[PDB]
Design a protein around this ligand. Structure first.
Ligand SMILES: Nc1ncnc2c1ncn2[C@@H]1O[C@H](COP(=O)(O)OP(=O)(O)O)[C@@H](O)[C@H]1O
Ligand SMILES: Nc1ncnc2c1ncn2[C@@H]1O[C@H](COP(=O)(O)OP(=O)(O)O)[C@@H](O)[C@H]1O
Ligand SMILES: [Mg+2]
Ligand SMILES: [Mg+2]
Lengths: 529, 521, 351
């Protein structure tokens, strides 16, 4: 038989292993297919009824999770368009901290509809301009849907109710307990005239009993042991050092040079006397506990035991700073008797044991403090990891509420209203860009549908009833999860809400990613290495 | 198809089949340790790649030594480890419970039922069961000073009934109780030393209210110094006593031979200064974590004293706690308040080895075990058996509530849940019924391991519990049913509470997984 | 505490560094994900000298990876222990030097050394008080030798009085992989002499003749040679990384080991580590110069360098200073002076 040799020009100068795709049929449609596959991968984990997923990475580590960002991080994607979608989702996670699945669902829907718009006859530029016009209109419409702005962010009973919705979709069936725990921990440290910093909430995981035995502590817990023979204090003055608890020496090489016998006899006694004087001078200021970030010498430990000083060491360079913030102490690079202003104060310091784990606890009787800790108890490491992820989501929700106080209804009410008003706007646009606009509105129906598909009901009836009830003027009506037959419910009365800022950023980033993917026309790929 | 989404070699499974496969794998995991439960339970032998073998009856150990790689099966290993960490006993009941929970609801999963209904039913049932256990447990407020030891002895005897040392349980239980009546208020497990010496009978094991430890490496002259004292004073040290360089940074420059001789004499003068400072304090036994030279050995031998070097740190801390001194890193102030005091010190021959014994201290917060066996795995299994009793005694000292064993509490909870299920309508009724029926795998396994007819015994137990017999379980020796609260089969309620919570958590976690993805390598 | 940053240049340098870091990480308990699972805290007394701790508990190496061709970074990222490095520390070009010293030193290097100098500035900003640099490269290549030498000069300009150590491979006696190897080696030794405190010359054939005869079983590729070099480097740096009966940084070894500043070339050894100032170095250079002249007398391959900007007298100065180095080494033995040129003529008259 015969062969089709090659085409002259660029096809003959291309290296071996490289690829070149050009045109709509070889570039655009294949990208749309890849994005659709990526969206279908994570669609099933949306909402309170979304099911858990289990992933094993290339190092044989195990993840059991519902969060979309973690799932995308643990997978190994190869197609560039899916990489753009993943990067958009990660940017949304970094900017806000919740709503990394709305991005994927919306972008997939937008590209899926753009495929048929291109099939019918429209050009890519018109689709793009319609999408931008619709996005601007949606951002204009959104502020009018806001209801129930947050009133007081230092009231425990209101904060507990505001954070319940963000955790219900991760730990359905345990939302009240975790919500109350996170509310206490967050209300503890919010400072007046204060930026709320997220770092100041710490999580400690100890294997043991069920989740319901978890607790919150106003202070710190370290998984360490005491170096000395004193074990507890009842009123602690704390001195913190970043240098080793030992006799300090020259930076340049130094040798002890002796010429007579008497110096040889007296050297060790001189060193011991100096070390004793230093320890006694430190102790005379009233410090009961010394915390260091380096080595402790044997003689220094012996003299600390002589004068009843609790000695703890930890080597992280970051736990030391956080402890200094917790107790109000200032680190010292020298081994000198500290001044009163550099004293830390703690109500209790003690060594305890929880379920085979030995810990050292710095505990305050104060209600505010500077940082706080959450102690989690579970029967499996994966469960505690999932609970930690839920805690992070709740804390980020509190931070966003600090930034902006406005809430919008959830459960699909906002998306239905946006789609209705965008369709109404698009019916009055004369030109070819109206079709694109209408498609944009239809892309908002993928959010309620998914919910219904996860709840085990028929999405078409739910969407029809939502449209029918929104035609009458009820803007706060969404899907009812408890019912086994399709139904609708008032979300404002039932307290299902979500932040304005999250929805704003989600819409923006999803539209940006979809348009960026649509703009690419031809692809040149090097050979994988 | 030209460019694929994920990397080549990624394996994905989803739907009902993968959930059914996970449930199937959990059954194999539970079968691995199924026949090790009860007074008539066997034990397993596992061999690793190098050739060493290990013989065990403890469930957590067997699960650890199995190289399980199935992601759904690893959860049962994790819950067993957690149960071992928290309470220390009951690491096989939880595994069978979890497997039975999965197996009883497998058929409903096959029919197409939403797993969240199953999860809700499991959570409700677990809450009800834990509340019932807390309600019906027996406790005594001001029991006694003697009725508070008998309860711990019964708990230990029950905890030892299925181990290799069962026949001598009455001999061992007593000892372990004493062991935990001296451990202060923190009850540190490092305060109890376990020593294993080959050769001897199991009835030759002993407990010393004091301390004992092995002989260390010794230089010449150790055999010329006394080996028994009656009221000695002990010096505990952290100082290296031998002729050596003062410091690694040191350097000596000298110009005359007279100063050379003086420098030579200086080192001997320093060492002898330390030795005289030790001697003049009145101590007769000296111990140090750091080496002792031969010169020091002969110096101590010439003055009728005893010395030891390179003592392990744990043993030295244990000696401090038993005798009541303090570790000294310097010899410039050896007062009377920093020395120990015992009532007898001796060095004795124990089956091919030499052991140092400090006994006769009534102020001791420490005890030490000496175990006598015939092969390495024998003493290892003896120690593993004693650990369960130690942990049970510690847990029983704080919270003192007791429930009856043998399966009485399982059948009581099953009856309660079945009576509750008939009240509520819907699929919740069937799911609570399945949960109630899954609780009687413990008495069935006891009867099966013993070699009885389980159906007849289960029918009699169900009839006895439905009528009225709260504490009725299986009598293994008489091959029948009997009251297990008057036969003294007692166990703390924490074991059952933790087992139920852990098993329910594992079942709920396994049921809620939709699909599995494996990445290459 | 007295941090050291490590720089790898070229294919050989990258291959050696990828195993150096692998054999270090297992000692300190680090994982390929960056976490820590060690047992003894003695591993953490001097952990900060080589690893920078990030928020969240990860440890990242203080390393910069450099080459003019993107081939080797793709392998490094795709290989083992290749995901703990900072993703922003990979610097690469688009063409490559093609085993030309002049292209690496003048044309392609000059437009990329600025990126390396902007990365080392950010890596130095995070250390409390740095003490020196580690460099790994080759003398027979273009990117390894010329570009590496230019980088050494630039670092010496930017950081005046910080120590600098190199681990350079050297051409083999009876086999030369590249035709222009003498030129590159001679032109790089000139500027290795005056800009480093110590150099650890490593030969390929000498260490290559250990796997066949001592290891009893091999027909290997560069592979295990690289692992042996990494083991030698770890045995060298254990003093810096770990405390012992007498800990001493590389300066505290050099001061006892280097009496005269310009004679700072060593020959290693390994007995499972030995480092020696054996004057058998004077035998290696005597060979290289012997080749250099033999080619320079014929002006062979000269137009490949002259076209890039270099002048003819640079070779003359390089060979003159190589001869000076050889004579300085020879003046320490007084026994090789017995082997002077045998007299051939017959004029042995009055005086
Ligand atoms: N009680 C509830 N009933 C119905 N829908 C809910 C309820 N609680 C939360 N949701 C919905 O869950 C959706 C998001 O869940 P989640 O899986 O966290 O997605 P994402 O991670 O993208 O926010 C929200 O759009 C919200 O409307
Ligand atoms: N004398 C006894 N008569 C009947 N059953 C007993 C007796 N002693 C112990 N058991 C039963 O043995 C079971 C536990 O056996 P074991 O191997 O210890 O399992 P686990 O380690 O999980 O407790 C308990 O359910 C307990 O009721
Ligand atoms: Mg969410
Ligand atoms: Mg048991």
């Amino acid at each position: 038989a015969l062969h089709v040799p090659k085409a002259p020009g660029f096809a003959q100068m291309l290296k071996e292993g490289a690829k070149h795709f050009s045109g709509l049929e070889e570039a655009v449609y294949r990208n749309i297919q890849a994005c659709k596959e990526l969206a279908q991968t994570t669609r099933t984990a949306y909402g309170p009824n979304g099911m858990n997923k289990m992933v094993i990475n290339h190092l044989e580590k195990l993840f059991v999770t519902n969060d979309a960002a973690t799932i995308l991080r643990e997978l190994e994607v190869q197609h560039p368009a899916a990489k753009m979608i993943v990067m958009a989702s990660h940017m949304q996670e970094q900017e806000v901290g919740d709503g990394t699945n709305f991005v994927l669902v919306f972008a997939g829907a937008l590209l899926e509809l753009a495929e048929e718009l291109l099939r019918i006859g429209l050009s890519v530029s018109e689709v793009i301009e319609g999408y931008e016009i619709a996005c601007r209109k949606a951002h204009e419409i959104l502020p009018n849907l806001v209801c129930c702005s947050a009133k007081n962010l230092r009231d425990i009973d209101e904060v507990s109710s505001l954070l319940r919705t963000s955790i219900m979709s991760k730990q359905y069936g345990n939302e009240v307990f975790l919500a109350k725990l996170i509310a206490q921990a967050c209300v503890s440290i919010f400072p007046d005239s204060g930026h709320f910093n997220v770092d100041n909430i710490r999580v400690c995981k100890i294997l043991g009993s069920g989740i319901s035995s978890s607790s919150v502590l106003h202070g710190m817990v370290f998984k360490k042991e005491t170096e000395g023979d004193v074990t507890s204090v009842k009123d602690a003055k704390i001195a913190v050092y970043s240098c080793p608890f030992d006799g300090m020496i020259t930076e340049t090489k130094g040798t002890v040079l002796i010429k007579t016998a008497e110096e040889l006899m007296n050297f060790s006694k001189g060193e011991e006397n100096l070390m004793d004087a230093q320890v006694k001078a430190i102790a005379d200021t009233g410090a009961n506990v010394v915390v260091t970030g380096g080595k402790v010498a044997d003689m220094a430990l012996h003299y600390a035991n002589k004068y009843n000083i609790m000695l703890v060491r930890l080597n992280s360079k970051w736990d030391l700073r956080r402890l200094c913030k917790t107790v109000g102490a200032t680190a010292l690079p020298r081994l000198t008797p500290p001044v009163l202003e550099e004293m830390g104060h703690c109500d209790s310091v003690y060594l305890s044991e929880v379920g085979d784990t030995q810990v050292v606890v710095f505990k305050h009787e104060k209600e505010d403090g500077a940082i706080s800790t959450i102690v989690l108890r579970g029967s499996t490491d994966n469960l505690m990891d999932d609970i930690e992820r839920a805690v992070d989501d709740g804390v980020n929700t509190f931070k966003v509420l600090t930034r902006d106080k406005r809430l919008v209804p959830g459960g699909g009410a906002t998306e239905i209203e946006l789609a209705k008003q965008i369709t109404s706007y698009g019916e009055t646009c004369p030109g070819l860009e109206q079709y694109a606009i209408k498609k944009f509105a239809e892309a908002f129906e993928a959010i309620p549908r998914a919910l219904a598909e996860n709840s085990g009901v028929k999405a078409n009836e739910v969407i029809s009833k939502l449209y029918a009830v929104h035609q009458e003027g009820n803007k706060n009506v969404g899907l009812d999860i408890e019912a086994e037959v399709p139904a609708v419910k008032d979300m404002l009365e039932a307290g299902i809400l979500d932040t304005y800022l999250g929805k704003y950023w989600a819409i923006k980033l999803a539209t940006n990613a979809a348009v960026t993917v649509l703009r690419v026309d031809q692809i040149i790929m090097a050979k994988p290495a | 198809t030209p460019v694929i989404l994920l990397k080549e070699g990624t394996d994905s499974s989803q739907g009902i089949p993968q959930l059914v496969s996970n449930i199937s794998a959990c059954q194999v995991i539970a079968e691995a340790v199924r026949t090790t439960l009860g007074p008539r339970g066997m034990d397993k032998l596992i061999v690793d790649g190098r050739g060493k073998a290990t013989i065990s009856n403890d469930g957590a150990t067997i699960l650890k030594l199995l190289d399980v790689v199935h992601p759904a099966a690893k959860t049962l290993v994790d819950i067993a480890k957690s149960q071992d960490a928290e309470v220390g006993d009951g690491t096989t009941s939880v595994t069978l419970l979890a497997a039975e929970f999965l197996k009883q609801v497998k058929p409903y999963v096959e029919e197409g039922l939403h797993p969240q209904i199953i999860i809700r039913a499991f959570r409700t049932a677990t809450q009800l069961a834990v509340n019932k256990i807390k309600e019906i447990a027996v406790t005594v407020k001001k029991a006694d000073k003697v009725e508070q030891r008998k309860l711990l002895e019964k708990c230990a005897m029950t905890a030892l009934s299925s181990k290799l040392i069962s026949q001598q349980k009455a001999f061992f239980a007593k000892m372990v109780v004493d062991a935990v009546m001296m451990l202060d208020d923190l009850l540190q497990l490092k305060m109890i030393g376990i020593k294993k010496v080959q050769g001897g009978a199991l009835e030759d094991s002993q407990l010393v209210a004091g301390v004992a430890f092995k002989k260390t490496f010794s230089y010449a002259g150790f055999e010329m110094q006394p080996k028994k004292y009656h009221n000695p004073k002990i010096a505990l040290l952290n100082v290296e006593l031998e002729l050596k360089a003062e410091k690694d940074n040191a350097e000596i420059r000298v110009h005359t031979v007279e100063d050379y001789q003086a420098i030579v004499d200086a080192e001997w003068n320093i060492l002898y200064d330390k030795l005289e400072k030790i001697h003049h304090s009145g101590a007769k036994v000296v111990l140090s974590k750091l080496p002792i030279g031969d010169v020091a050995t002969q110096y101590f031998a010439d003055r009728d004293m005893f010395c030891a070097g390179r003592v392990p740190e744990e043993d030295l801390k244990r000696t401090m706690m038993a005798c009541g001194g303090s570790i000294q890193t310097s010899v410039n102030a050896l007062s009377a308040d920093v020395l120990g005091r015992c009532q007898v010190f001796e060095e004795t021959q124990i089956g091919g080895e030499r052991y140092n014994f400090f006994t006769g201290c009534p102020k001791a917060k420490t005890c030490t075990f000496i175990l006598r066996g015939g092969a390495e795995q024998f003493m290892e299994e003896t120690e593993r058996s004693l650990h369960d009793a130690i942990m049970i005694v510690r847990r029983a000292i704080k919270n003192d509530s007791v429930v009856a064993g043998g399966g009485a509490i399982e059948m009581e909870l099953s009856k309660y849940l079945r009576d509750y299920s008939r009240t509520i309508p819907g699929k919740q009724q069937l799911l609570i019924g399945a949960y109630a029926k899954a609780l009687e795998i413990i008495p069935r396994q006891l009867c099966d391991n013993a070699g009885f007819d389980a159906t007849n015994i289960l029918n009699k137990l169900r009839a006895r519990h439905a009528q009225g017999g709260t504490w009725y379980g299986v009598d293994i020796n008489n091959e029948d049913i009997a009251d297990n609260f008057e036969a003294f089969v007692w166990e703390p309620a924490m074991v059952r509470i933790n087992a139920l919570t852990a098993a329910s958590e594992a079942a709920c976690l396994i049921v809620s997984v939709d699909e599995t993805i494996k990445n290459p390598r | 505490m007295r941090e050291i940053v490590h720089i790898q240049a070229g294919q050989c340098g990258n291959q050696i560094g990828a195993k150096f870091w692998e054999v270090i990480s297992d000692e300190h308990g680090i994982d390929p994900t960056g976490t820590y699972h060690g047992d003894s805290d003695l591993q953490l007394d001097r952990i900060s000298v080589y690893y920078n701790e990030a928020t969240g508990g990860k440890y990242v190496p203080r390393a910069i990876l450099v080459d003019l061709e993107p081939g080797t970074m793709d392998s490094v990222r795709s290989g083992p222990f290749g995901q703990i490095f900072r993703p922003d520390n990979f610097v690469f070009g688009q063409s490559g030097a093609g085993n030309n010293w002049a292209k690496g030193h003048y044309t392609e290097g000059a437009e990329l050394v600025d990126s390396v100098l902007d990365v080392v500035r950010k890596e130095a900003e995070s250390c409390d008080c740095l003490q020196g640099f580690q460099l790994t490269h080759s003398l027979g290549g273009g990117t390894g030798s010329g570009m590496g030498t230019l980088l050494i000069s630039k670092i010496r300009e930017e950081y005046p009085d910080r120590i600098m150590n190199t681990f350079s491979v050297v051409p083999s006696p009876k086999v030369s992989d590249t035709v222009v190897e003498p030129y590159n080696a001679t032109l790089s030794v000139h500027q290795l002499v005056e800009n480093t405190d110590e150099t650890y010359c490593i030969d390929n054939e000498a260490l290559y003749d250990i796997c066949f005869r001592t290891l009893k079983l091999t027909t290997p590729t560069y592979g295990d040679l690289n692992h042996l070099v990494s083991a030698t480097m770890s045995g060298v740096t254990t003093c810096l990384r770990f405390p012992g009966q007498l800990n001493a940084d590389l300066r505290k070894l050099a001061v006892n080991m280097v009496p005269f500043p310009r004679l700072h070339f060593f020959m290693p050894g390994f007995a499972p580590t030995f480092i020696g100032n054996s004057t058998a170095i004077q035998e290696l250079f005597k060979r290289i110069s012997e080749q250099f002249t033999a080619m320079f007398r014929r002006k062979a391959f000269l137009h490949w360098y002259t076209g890039e900007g270099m002048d003819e007298m640079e070779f003359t100065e390089a060979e003159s200073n190589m001869n000076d180095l050889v004579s300085e080494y020879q003046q320490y033995q007084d026994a090789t002076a017995e082997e002077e040129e045998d007299f051939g003529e017959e004029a042995e008259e009055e005086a």
